[PDB]
Amino acid sequence: MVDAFLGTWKLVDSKNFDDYMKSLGVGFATRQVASMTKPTTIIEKNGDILTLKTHSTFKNTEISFKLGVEFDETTADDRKVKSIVTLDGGKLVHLQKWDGQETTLVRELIDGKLILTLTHGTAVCTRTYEKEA
Numbered sequence: 556m557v558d559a560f561l562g563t564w565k566l567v568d569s570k571n572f573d574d575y576m577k578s579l580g581v582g583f584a585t586r587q588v589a590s591m592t593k594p595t596t597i598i599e600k601n602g603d604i605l606t607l608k609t610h611s612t613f614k615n616t617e618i619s620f621k622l623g624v625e626f627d628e629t630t631a632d633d634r635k636v637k638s639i640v641t642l643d644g645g646k647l648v649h650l651q652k653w654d655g656q657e658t659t660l661v662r663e664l665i666d667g668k669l670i671l672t673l674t675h676g677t678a679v680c681t682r683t684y685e686k687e688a
């Protein structure tokens with residue numbers, strides 16, 4: 556069910572990421588560096604456990620989770636959130652909750668590219684990843 560998402564992906568297009576980061580309260584210097592980085596995202600499974608790594612010259616993260624089971628997460632911008640990831644309409648939907656706030660990170664495959672849509676407040680960011688061989 557998750558298998559077309561698996562692999563190594565590189566950022567090749569980003570729209571409105573500054574808006575998204577600013578909405579989350581990320582400081583200007585961090586937004587500035589992040590606007591020029593191109594992360595690599597690695598998605599792997601082992602049975603029911605998925606591991607999602609995000610690597611760059613600036614920040615690295617890693618999360619492991621089962622679909623549909625809440626997990627604690629500390630995000631790249633240091634929010635301590637309650638997270639759940641599920642498949643919805645063939646999209647991989649990651650919901651983060653903290654302080655009564657929410658943000659969604661939705662991943663969808665379109666023509667072999669991985670489209671990540673990030674929503675917080677009114678900010679909507681679209682980031683496109685292409686698969687590494």
Ligand SMILES: CCCCCCC(O)O
Pocket residue numbers: 576579594596609630631632671682
């Ligand atoms: C600021 C929170 C994390 C943003 C992740 C962006 C990505 O391309 O994976």
